[PDB]
Amino acid sequence: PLQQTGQLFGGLVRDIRRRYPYYLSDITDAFSPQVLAAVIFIYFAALSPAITFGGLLGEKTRNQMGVSELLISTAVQGILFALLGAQPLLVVGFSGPLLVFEEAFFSFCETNGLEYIVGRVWIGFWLILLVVLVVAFEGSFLVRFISRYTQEIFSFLISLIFIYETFSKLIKIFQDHPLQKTYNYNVLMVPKPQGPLPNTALLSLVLMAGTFFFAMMLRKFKNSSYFPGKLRRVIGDFGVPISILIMVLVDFFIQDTYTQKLSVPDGFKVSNSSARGWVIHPLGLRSEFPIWMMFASALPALLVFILIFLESQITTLIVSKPERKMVKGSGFHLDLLLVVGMGGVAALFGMPWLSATTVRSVTHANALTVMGKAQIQEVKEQRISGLLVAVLVGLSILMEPILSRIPLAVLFGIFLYMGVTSLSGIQLFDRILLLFKPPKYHPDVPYVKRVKTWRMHLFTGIQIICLAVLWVVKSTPASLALPFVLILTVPLRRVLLPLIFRNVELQCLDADDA
Amino acid sequence: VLAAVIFIYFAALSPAITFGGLLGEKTRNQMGVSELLISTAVQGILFALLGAQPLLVVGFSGPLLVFEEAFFSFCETNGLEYIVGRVWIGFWLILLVVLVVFISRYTQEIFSFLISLIFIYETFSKLIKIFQDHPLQKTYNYNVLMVPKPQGPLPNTALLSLVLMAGTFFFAMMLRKFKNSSYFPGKLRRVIGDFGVPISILIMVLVDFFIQDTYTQKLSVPDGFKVSNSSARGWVIHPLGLRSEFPIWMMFASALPALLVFILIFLESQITTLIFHLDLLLVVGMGGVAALFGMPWLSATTVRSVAQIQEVKEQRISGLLVAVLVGLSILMEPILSRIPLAVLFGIFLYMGVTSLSGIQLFDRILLLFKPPKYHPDVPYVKRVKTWRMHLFTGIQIICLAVLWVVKSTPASLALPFVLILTVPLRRVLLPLIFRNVELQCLDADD
Ligand SMILES: CCCCCCCC(=O)OC[C@H](COP(=O)(O)O[C@@H]1[C@H](O)[C@H](O)[C@@H](OP(=O)(O)O)[C@H](OP(=O)(O)O)[C@H]1O)OC(=O)CCCCCCC
Ligand SMILES: CCCCCCCC(=O)OC[C@H](COP(=O)(O)O[C@@H]1[C@H](O)[C@H](O)[C@@H](OP(=O)(O)O)[C@H](OP(=O)(O)O)[C@H]1O)OC(=O)CCCCCCC
Ligand SMILES: CCCCCCCCCCCC(=O)OC[C@H](COP(=O)(O)OCC[N+](C)(C)C)OC(=O)CCCCCCCCCCC
Ligand SMILES: CCCCCCCCCCCC(=O)OC[C@H](COP(=O)(O)OCC[N+](C)(C)C)OC(=O)CCCCCCCCCCC
Ligand SMILES: CCCCCCCCCCCC(=O)OC[C@H](COP(=O)(O)OCC[N+](C)(C)C)OC(=O)CCCCCCCCCCC
Ligand SMILES: CCCCCCCCCCCC(=O)OC[C@H](COP(=O)(O)OCC[N+](C)(C)C)OC(=O)CCCCCCCCCCC
Ligand SMILES: *[C@@H]1O[C@H](CO[C@@H]2O[C@@H](C)[C@@H](O)[C@@H](O)[C@@H]2O)[C@@H](O[C@@H]2O[C@H](CO)[C@@H](O)[C@H](O)[C@H]2NC(C)=O)[C@H](O)[C@H]1NC(C)=O
Ligand SMILES: *[C@@H]1O[C@H](CO[C@@H]2O[C@@H](C)[C@@H](O)[C@@H](O)[C@@H]2O)[C@@H](O[C@@H]2O[C@H](CO)[C@@H](O)[C@H](O)[C@H]2NC(C)=O)[C@H](O)[C@H]1NC(C)=O
C-alpha cells in the first residue's frame, strides 16, 4: 500500500482498486447493534468537538468562521469521505492545530489589512494543487518512514491532551462558579450566567464522574461472565449510550441547579452575515485581493498541508495496524487526496478544512471492534457508521430540543472515557506502566525478555522526553511548529537511537507488529 | 512490635470513630465517640491483663450498633431513658454471666450478609437525609444560623457530602486493590494498602479542610475525658433515672434485651473467635459493668492481623499499648473535630462492601446471575445441581428478607432471636428439603 509504483496516480488507483470491490460488504456489514451503538457514541464524540471549536473559532475570527460553518463542513466532508474513502473508519473533523493556524492567519490578515476569508480561499487553492501533485507522484510512500516510535508518541500526546483538556474544562467550571458561603441568588442567566451559582460546579463534577464510572463499569460488564453472552455483549456495546442516558436523566430531574447544556446554531446560516456570504469570491469581497498574497498563500498552504497530512496519515497508520484485525485495506493516497481536496474546496465556501482526527478515529475503530472469547476477533469495517455520524452532525441544528437537555459534564465524562480507552494498545503506555512495576511482574513480551530492564526504561524515558518537548512546544506561542517537532522523531529514531541502542533492542522496542 | 502496634491501633481507631459518629448522631450523643473510645480503652486494658486469649480484639461492631439503634428507638417509642435502660440491661448481663459461671456457616453467613446490607443501606439513607436537609435550590437564605447546627438549607452541602463520601469510598477501594497489585515494591505496596482506610480518611479530610466556605457536619467530640453531651448525662448513670423515674416493669423486662445482647455477642464470638467461653464471659461482664457508666458493651473478634510464655507476654503488651493509645485518642480532639461525617459514611460503605468478600452466600448470589458454564470449580457447584444450589440460596435470601422486615418494624429489637431461629431451620427443615451430600457441600465448616 505504501510502495511506489512509478506511475502517475498509481497509489490512488491502487487504493481504489483494492477497496472498492468491498463496497457491497461495506454497506451490509453495518447491520448489527454494535454499529448502532458506535454510531451514537461517535456522534456525540464528533458533535461536541465541532461545537466547542466552532465557538472558539467564532470568538477568534469575529464570526467569519463559526459553529454553523464547522457543522456544515464536518457533515458534508464526512459524508463524502464515508462514501468515497479507502478507510471509512476515519472520522474527519476540526482539531486544535487547525484552530491555532486559523487564529494565526486571522491575526496576520488583520495586521496586513487583508480579508481573512479570501486568504483562506487562496490557501485552499494551493492546498488542492499541492495535494494533487503529491498524489500524482505518490508522495504518500513517505508514510513508511513513520514507525511505531512516532505513531505512539503522537497517539499518546493526543490522548494526554484530550484528558488534560477535559479536566481543564472542569476546572474552568469550578472557577466560574466557586464554592462560596453566599451567592447573588438573582444572577442573570443570559447569554450565560453572569456570576457564580451554587451547586453548579459540584453537580458538574458529579455528572462527569458518574458518566465516566458508568461507562467504565459497562465496559467491564461487556467482558464479564454475567448474564447470557449475547445480551451481555449487546448491553456492553451500548455502554456509553446507556451511561449518557443515565446521567442526562439524572440531570433532567434536578430542575433547580444550573448546568451548561449543548448549544447549536438556531439555523443553517453564516455566523456573520455582514462579514461574508455562503460563497467567497476569490478576487475579494469589499477590497481587491493583492496578487503578492495570491502567491504568498503557498506558504500557509504548505503549513496547513503538513498539519493535515501528518495528522491524517498517522491516524491511518494507527487504525490500520495488523493487530487491530482490519482486512479490507486502507488507502493513504485516496484518503489524503479526499481530505485535503475537500478542505481546499471548502475554503471556497468559507468553511474549515478538516483532518482525520486521532482520538475520534481510534474510538470509532474500537467501538466497531469485536473481542474474541483478551483477543481481537475482527472489526466491523463498513461505510454506514461514519456516514450516519456525519449526517447526524449535519442535522444537529434541527435536533436542538434533544441536545439542549444534554449537560456538558456528561460529555466531559465521555471524553475522559475516550481518552483513557485510547491508551490501550500503545506500547509506550505499557512501558510507562512498567516503570512502576518491579521487573518480576513485567509481561512476557520481546522487549521485556530480550532487553535489559534499565535499557527498556531508558528507551521509554527518551520517548517521555520527546513527549515533554512536544507538550512544551504546544504550550508556547510556537505551537504551530508542532508538526515539524514531531517529524524530528523520525531522524531521532533512524539516526540518533542506533547510536544508543543495538539493532535487536531497537527491533524489539520498535516492532512493526506485535 | 511498634509497627504492629500502630497497625492494630489504626485498625481499632477507624471503626471506633466511624461507629462513634453514627451512634452519637443517632442517640443525640448520649453515647458517642468519647464514650466508645474510653470503653474500648478500658475494656481492652482489662482484657489484655486478664483475658485468656490476649490475641482477641474487643470493640464495637456492626451488630452492636444495630442493637443500640434499635434499643434507642424502642426507648424513644416508650418514653424511657435509653442510658438507664442500658444500665439495667447491664445488670442483667452481669446476672446472666454469674448464672453461667450449633452455629454453622448458614447462620454466620446470613448474619454477616445482613450486617453488610445494613451498612450499605444506612450509608445511602444518611446521604439521602443530608440531601433532604440541604436541598439543591436556585436560591438560599444567607442569614442561616449555625449555633446548634444549620437552621436552614445551605448551598453545596449535600453535593459536597456526596463527593466526600464517594471519594473516601473510592480511595479506600483503590488502595485495597493496590495492596494486591503488581505496582511499587512489595513491602511499600503492602504497607500502603494496610493503612488504606486511614490514608483515604486523611486525603478526604484534607480535601474538606481546604474547602473552607462550604459547610459539612463534623464529628462531635468533647474536650478531654468528658461525655459527648454533658447536658444530657454524666459519667455515672443512676439506675432509678436521671430526669424521670425508671419504671420497675422495665427493671424486670431488661432481661429480654440483655438476652438478645448476649446472643449477639456470642454470635460474634462464634463467627470470629471460633472461626474461649471464659473470654466471652469476661467480655459480657465488662460490658454489663460498662453499662453502669453509660458506655458501650463490646464484643471480642478474631483476625487481629498478627517460648510460649514469651509469645503470650508480647501480645499482652501489644493489647495494653493499643488500648492506652485508643483511650488517649480522645485528646486528639482538634484533629477529630475536623473529620466530616461524610468521610466516615464512605468508610462505613467501604466496610459493608468489603465484608461481603469471603461469604459463600454472596458468591452464590453472584452465581445466580452467571451462566452455569462460568460457575467456579467448588464442591457446591460440581456436586450439587445448579437449581438445587439456587434453591438453597433463595431460601437464605428469604431468611434475609424476613430479617430485614423484622428490623424495619417496632419489633426490631428481637432481631437476634430471629437470627438464632436459623439454627433450627438449618437443623430441621433443611434436611427435609435437601440431601446430606448437598448440605455438606452447601454448608461446610471449611
Ligand atoms: C433477561 C435475562 C433472562 C435470562 C435469559 C433467558 C434465557 C436463559 O434462561 O438464560 C439462562 C442463563 C444460562 O444461559 P444458557 O445456559 O442457556 O446458555 C449459555 C449462555 O447464555 C450463552 O448461550 C453461551 O455462553 P457465552 O456466549 O460464552 O456467554 C453458552 O452457550 P454456548 O457457548 O454453548 O454456545 C451457554 O453456556 O443463565 C443466566 O445467565 C442467568 C440470567 C441472568 C439473570 C437474569 C435475571 C436477573
Ligand atoms: C514512592 C516510591 C519510592 C520508591 C523507593 C525505592 C524503589 C526501588 O527501590 O526500586 C526498585 C524496585 C524493584 O524492586 P526489586 O526488583 O529489587 O524487588 C522486587 C519487588 O520490588 C519486591 O521486592 C518483591 O516482589 P513481591 O514481594 O512479590 O511483591 C521481589 O522481591 P523478593 O520476592 O525476592 O523478596 C522482587 O521481585 O522497582 C520497582 O519495583 C518500582 C520502583 C518505584 C517506581 C517509581 C517511583 C517514582
Ligand atoms: C475527589 C475529590 C474532589 C474534590 C473537589 C473539591 C473542589 C474544590 C473547590 C475549591 C473551591 C473552588 O471551587 O474555587 C474555585 C477554584 C478557582 O479558584 P477561585 O474560587 O476562582 O479563587 C480562589 C478562591 N479561594 C482561594 C477561596 C478558593 O477552582 C479550583 O481550582 C478547583 C478545581 C477543582 C477540580 C476538581 C477535580 C475533581 C477530581 C475528580 C475528577 C473526576
Ligand atoms: C512518568 C514519570 C517517570 C518517572 C517515574 C518512574 C521512575 C522510574 C525509575 C525507577 C525504575 C526502576 O526502578 O527500574 C529498576 C531498574 C533495574 O534494572 P537494572 O538493569 O538492574 O539497572 C541497572 C542500573 N543502571 C541503570 C545504573 C545501569 O533500574 C533502572 O536502571 C531504572 C532505569 C534507569 C534509567 C533511566 C530510566 C528513565 C527515567 C524515567 C523516565 C523519565
Ligand atoms: C453514588 C450514588 C449516589 C446515590 C444517592 C444520591 C442521594 C440523593 C438523594 C436525593 C433525594 C432527596 O433527598 O431529595 C432532596 C431534594 C428535595 O428538595 P425539596 O423538594 O425542596 O424538599 C425538601 C426536603 N423534603 C424532601 C424532605 C421535603 O431533592 C434534591 O435536590 C436531590 C437532588 C439529588 C441529586 C443526587 C445526585 C445524583 C448523583 C448520581 C450518581 C453520580
Ligand atoms: C437476587 C434476587 C433474586 C433474583 C434472582 C434472579 C436470577 C434468577 C435466575 C437464576 C439463574 C438461573 O437461571 O437458574 C437456572 C437453573 C438451572 O437449572 P438446571 O436444570 O440445573 O440447568 C440445566 C438445564 N438448563 C440450563 C436448560 C436449565 O434453574 C433455575 O431456574 C433455578 C431456579 C430455582 C428456584 C429458586 C430460585 C431462587 C432465586 C432467588 C429468589 C428468592
Ligand atoms: C460580525 O462582523 C461584524 C462586522 O465585521 C466587520 O465588517 C465585515 C464586513 C468585515 O470586513 C470584518 O472584517 C469587519 O470587522 C463585527 O463587527 C466589527 O467589529 C470589529 C472589531 O471591533 C470592528 O473593526 C468593525 O468595524 C465592526 N463592524 C461593525 C459593522 O460593527 C462583529 O464583531 C462580528 N460579530 C461577532 C460576534 O464577532
Ligand atoms: C444533648 O442532649 C440534649 C438533651 O437531651 C435530653 O436528655 C437526654 C438524657 C434524654 O432524656 C433526651 O430525650 C433529652 O432531650 C439534646 O437536646 C435535644 O435536642 C433535640 C435535637 O435538636 C431536640 O429535638 C430536643 O427538643 C432537645 N431536648 C432538650 C430537652 O433540650 C441535645 O440535642 C443533645 N446534643 C447533641 C449535640 O446531640
Numbering used by the authors:
A (entry chain C): 371 to 743, 751 to 891
B (entry chain A): 405 to 505, 515 to 688, 702 to 732, 751 to 890
Original paper wording:
Anion Exchanger 1 (AE1) is an elevator-type transporter that plays a key role in acid-base homeostasis of erythrocytes. Human AE1 contains 911 residues which are divided into two domains: an N-terminal cytosolic domain (CD, residues 1–347) and a C-terminal transmembrane domain (TMD, residues 371–911), joined by a flexible linker (residues 348–370). Similar to other facilitated transporters from the SLC4 family, e.g., the human electrogenic Na+/HCO3– cotransporter 1 (NBCe1) and the fungal borate transporter Bor1, AE1 operates via an elevator mechanism, in which the transporter switches between the inward-facing (IF) and outward-facing (OF) states by an elevator-like motion of the TD relative to SD.
In contrast, in the identified IF2 state, it is fully ordered, with R730 interacting with the N-terminal end of TM3. Analysis of different states within the same AE1 dimer clearly demonstrates that the two subunits function independently. In the OF state, TM10 is well-ordered, with R730 facing the extracellular space. In the predominant IF state, IF1, TM10 is completely unfolded, with R730 inaccessible to the putative substrate pathway. In the IF1 state, TM10 is unfolded and the putative substrate-binding residues fail to form a well-defined binding site; our simulations also show that anions merely remain near the intracellular vestibule. Recently, a study was published by Su et al. in which they reported the first high resolution structure of AE1 dimer in the IF-OF state in the presence of bicarbonate; the IF state of this structure corresponds to one of our IF states (IF1). Extra densities that correspond to phosphatidylcholine (PC) lipids (used for the nanodisc reconstitution) were modeled in the structure. We also modeled two PIP2 lipids at the interface of the two AE1 subunits. Based on the distinctive shape of the densities, we have assigned them as PIP210.
